[PDB]
Structure to design on (341 residues):
């Protein structure tokens, strides 16, 4: 169990003005810190944010959150469930800003909702320093789905924040799970354009300077923002991601046209990861992995994801028998026998 703390700075809020927060299970004898960003799509105008407030309210408000959460997968403290970082300090940051962790806009006079995801991350880090993060030696910012994209948008800002607060020794790293999407041709972009204006969304400065005014939406796509990043980032992406296929209007007797479409999507995803040295990409139809209890089961080329992450740690201190770049080459879903059932 991780226990809830609402933010002491109550001006940093969820969508409806209620305080944001974080769940914490500390580990005294450890100097490693894992901050996990929850996912859950997003909303981009008044009417579809209102819809989300009726039937997905816990993603927009803290008024109904429980006092405790169970840590699962990489947030588990048990070595059998979490061979990678079972002894670490564990933090789960709930997603209640509906802005892919990019917003910096208060509730107001002219704003029905607050979109403060980027400021929520910054405030959690600030308040955690007084609870032991000041002694840390590695801070891993991780996340799944919209939280995975949020890692890409925020990892360098967290590094910059700690450097300016006087903590140059804390090594900030990123782990982006299922947040690496393609702006490809559909089988049969305005939502994100149109949300960044609604959220006052912020993107990393170097990527902003490449694409410039009005084109910041480009920085929500992994293969375009990752080359501008400076912190080390490990990328986990299923080759046949279910969220990707949904937006592409694919619904799984597959005939030639769809066969080529699916095979092409795989090969395109594979291509965008060829120059990503730390990555894990199985040939499976799925979505998210790192906080699932059975995340230890999947393997690429004989290496599991917890092992690949351990090899990543060793690389940041070629390694014999301990690889870090693991991308499937077989071209159809399920062609890896270890895929989730
Ligand atoms: C031609 C063109 O613009 N294609 C395109 C653009 C944006 C998306 N957006 C998206 C992808 C995956 C997951 C969530 C959103 C998908 C396809
Ligand atoms: C609380 O957060 C807001 C928004 O980030 C900031 O402007 C304000 O200075 C913060 N208050 C304190 C006491 O840090």
């Amino acid at each position: 169990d991780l226990r809830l703390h609402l933010l002491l700075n109550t001006s940093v809020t969820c969508n409806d003005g209620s305080p944001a927060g974080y769940y914490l299970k500390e580990s005294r004898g450890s100097r490693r810190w894992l901050l996990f960003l929850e996912g859950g799509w997003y909303c981009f105008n008044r009417e579809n944010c209102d819809s989300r407030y009726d039937t997905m309210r816990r993603l927009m408000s803290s008024r109904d959150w429980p006092r405790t959460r169970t840590g699962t997968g990489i947030l588990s403290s048990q070595p059998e469930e979490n061979p990678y970082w079972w002894n670490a300090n564990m933090v789960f940051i709930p997603y209640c800003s509906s802005d892919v962790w990019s917003g910096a806009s208060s509730k107001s006079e002219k704003n029905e909702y607050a979109f403060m995801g980027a400021l929520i991350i910054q405030e959690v880090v600030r308040e955690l320093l007084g609870r032991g993060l000041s002694g840390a030696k590695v801070l891993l910012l991780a996340g799944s789905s919209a939280g995975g994209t949020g890692v890409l948008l925020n990892v360098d800002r967290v590094a910059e924040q700690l450097e300016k607060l006087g903590y140059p020794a804390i090594q900030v790293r990123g782990l982006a799970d299922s947040g690496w999407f393609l702006d490809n041709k559909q089988y049969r972009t305005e939502a994100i354009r149109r949300g960044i204006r609604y959220w006052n969304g912020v993107v990393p400065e170097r990527c902003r300077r490449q694409f410039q005014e009005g084109e910041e939406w480009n920085c929500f796509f992994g293969y375009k923002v990752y080359p501008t990043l400076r912190s080390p980032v490990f990328v986990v992406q299923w080759l046949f991601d279910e969220a990707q296929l949904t937006v592409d209007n694919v619904h799984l007797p597959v005939q030639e046209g769809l066969r080529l479409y699916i095979q092409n999507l795989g090969r395109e995803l594979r291509h965008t990861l060829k120059d990503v040295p730390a990555s894990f990409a199985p040939a499976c139809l799925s979505h998210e992995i790192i906080i699932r209890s059975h995340w230890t089961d999947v393997q690429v080329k004989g290496t599991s994801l917890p092992r690949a992450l351990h090899c990543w740690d060793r690389s940041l201190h070629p390694l014999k028998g301990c690889p870090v770049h693991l991308v499937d080459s077989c071209p159809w879903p399920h062609c890896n026998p270890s895929c989730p059932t």
User: Anything to note?
Assistant: The first helix runs from residue 46 to 55. The first strand starts at residue 2 and ends at 6. Residues 190 and 230 are 29 Å apart (CA to CA). Residues 1-341 form one domain.
